Structures are given as C-alpha cells and as structure tokens.
Amino acid sequence: GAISSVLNDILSRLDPPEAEVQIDRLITGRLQSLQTYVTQQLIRAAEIR
Amino acid sequence: VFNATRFASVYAWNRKRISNCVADYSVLYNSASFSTFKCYGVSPTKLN
C-alpha cells in the first residue's frame, strides 16, 4: 500500500512527516511478513521436532 | 518553463520536454518568486 517498495526510495524522496506515513506501511507489511514466516517456521519446527 | 513569453490554455497546455541538462530545483522552492510550491510523491528539496 505504500508509494514505493524500496525503503531508500521513500527516504530519498519524501520529507520526514510524509515519509513516515509511507515507511510505516512498509514496516507494518514487512513486520507481518516476518510474523508469518516465523509463525510457519515455529510450526514447521514442531513438525520436524 | 517559468519565464516563458506566454502560456497556453488549460486544455492545450505547452508541454516542454526537459532532457539532457541539470538545474537546481530546491532553489525554486525557496526562490521567493512563486505563490505556491507543493510537490506530490516527492519533497521539493530532496528531488534536487
């Protein structure tokens, strides 16, 4: 949902008050990506265990 | 672009192609010669 997928692109383009709105979307998305990855690895770990 | 002789209509605007050059854009924001300077999708000072 952000204006761009590259973090440095938003940092190099938008001001801090405008970049934080778009950077938060990447953080919210990239955080959920790790929460999904870690959730699967934690579950698959129990399977392999 | 800015100091042109005359502008065209709001539907037949004169689209000037700017290519193979360099120029300061942050000074235009702080030139004190324009009414409004607001950039969307990019900061007016960082695009310079």
Residues A4, A22 contacting (CB under 8 angstroms): yes
Amino acid at A36: T
Residue with tokens 């120029």: B23
Question: d(Cα A40, Cα A15) in Å, to the nearest integer?
Answer: 37
Q: Is A20 on the interface with B (CB under 8 A)?
A: no
Answer whether B38's CB lies under 8 Å from B32's CB. no
CA dist B48 and B44 (Å) reads 7
Contacts of A3 in chain B (CB under 8 A): 41
Distances in Å between the Cα of A49 and the Cα atoms of A20, A43, B4, B34 are: 41, 10, 74, 68
**Chain B interface mutation, best of A4, A10, A18, highest count of B Cβ atoms under 10 Å:** A18
What method did the depositors use to determine the structure? cryo-EM
Total number of residues shown for chain B? 48
Give the resolution to one decimal, in Å: 4.3
The HSE-up count of residue A21 (CA atoms within 13 Å, CB side) is 8
Return all residues near A15 (Cβ < 8 A) that are at least 6 apart. Answer: B43, B45, B46
Burial class of A26 by CB neighbour count within 10 A (0 to 12, 13 to 18, 19+): middle
